[PDB]
């Protein structure tokens, strides 16, 4: 009958202290299409290098994670892994 597609989220951390949501969003589109992006921050409105971003599909995120693993950002090394 009717079925709802299953979404997936990527675990990204280790981003620079100068990295913002706009910068990260730009990166996601490079590997695919950023459909959902959220930046972990407190009520103070302080952005943080730890956040999650869901991909339109599973294949896109899968091919993106392999190529994005070890990606150098501002001379820094970030870690990316798939969730469930």
CA dist., res. 64 & res. 5, Å (int): 20
Please name the method used to determine this structure: NMR
Look up the domain containing 55 and give its range: 7-82
Residue 47 domain flag = yes
Residue 56 domain flag = yes
CA distances from 7 to 36, 59, 84 (A): 10, 11, 11
Pairing of strands 76-77, 51-55: unpaired
Residue 15 domain flag = yes
Residue 2 domain flag = no
Buried b (16+ CB within 10 A) or exposed e, 37-70: eebeeeeeeebebebebbbeeeebbeebbeebee
- Number of structural domains (the chain) is 1
- With both helix axes pointing from N to C terminus, report the angle between 58-68 and 21-31 in degrees, rounded to the nearest 10: 110
CA dist., res. 50 & res. 41, Å (int): 9
């Amino acid at each position: 009958g009717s079925h709802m597609l299953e979404k997936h989220k990527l675990f990204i951390s280790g981003l620079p202290f100068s990295c913002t949501k706009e910068e990260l969003e730009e990166i996601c589109k490079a590997h695919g299409t950023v459909k959902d992006l959220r930046l972990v921050t407190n009520r103070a409105g302080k952005p943080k290098g730890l956040a999650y971003v869901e991909y339109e599909n599973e294949s896109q995120a899968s091919q993106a994670v392999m190529k994005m693993d070890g990606m150098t950002i501002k001379e820094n090394i970030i870690k990316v892994a798939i969730s469930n």
